[PDB]
Design a protein around this ligand. Structure first.
Ligand SMILES: O=C(O)C[C@H](NC(=O)c1ccc(NC(=O)NC2CC2)cc1)c1cccc(C(F)F)c1
Length: 166
């Protein structure tokens, strides 16, 4: 049992809250936190930059060792690394970046990675700096993920739009 509080129930297994995922991870210390990664695990900005800064750059040092050994991930793929001070594990998931011309169909493959874990704290994949429509990202999440997902949405106006239009 992870100590999530204040989430709104959208479906049987999807919950949502207006919160920064970094602050939710620091407080809850969940079994799994999802990072919105790129294929190189270069955590510069957005959710990845913010989670990495909260680990004092330990997530980036571990990630560079992983890439030196294994090479890059695929768009739609994932890897499990340490959660450091934020969680037991971090599931690094690569959603398509539409600003780079990546195929939005890969968003469903990205969310399929969540089904390997019973419960996760996660952001909306491919939203924010990745350029995709967040309303579409929540619909793909609800229609793909079967395990328990707790979505932390940073922007209040987007949170209100997501709930109202669901
Ligand atoms: O969560 C959402 O609302 C979707 C998306 N989120 C991010 O891009 C996102 C980026 C960073 C962080 N966390 C921090 O930066 N933490 C601070 C302490 C360093 C969290 C989430 C977003 C946010 C703002 C505006 C828009 C708009 F384009 F629609 C989308």
């Amino acid at each position: 049992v992870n100590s999530f509080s204040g989430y709104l129930k959208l479906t049987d297994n999807v919950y949502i809250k207006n919160a920064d995922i970094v602050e939710e991870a620091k407080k809850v210390k969940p079994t799994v936190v999802v990072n919105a990664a790129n294929v190189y695990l270069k955590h510069g900005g957005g959710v990845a930059g913010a989670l990495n800064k909260a680990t004092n750059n330990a997530m980036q040092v571990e990630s560079d060792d992983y890439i030196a050994t294994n090479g890059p991930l695929k768009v739609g793929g994932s890897c499990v690394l340490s959660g450091h001070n934020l969680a037991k594990h971090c599931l690094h998931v690569v959603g398509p970046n539409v600003n780079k011309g990546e195929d939005i169909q890969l968003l469903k493959s990205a969310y399929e990675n969540f089904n390997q874990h019973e419960v996760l704290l996660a952001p909306l994949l491919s939203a924010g700096i990745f350029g995709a429509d967040p309303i579409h990202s929540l619909r793909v999440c609800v229609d793909t993920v079967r395990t328990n997902v707790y979505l932390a949405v940073f922007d209040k106006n987007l949170y209100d739009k997501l709930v109202s239009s669901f």
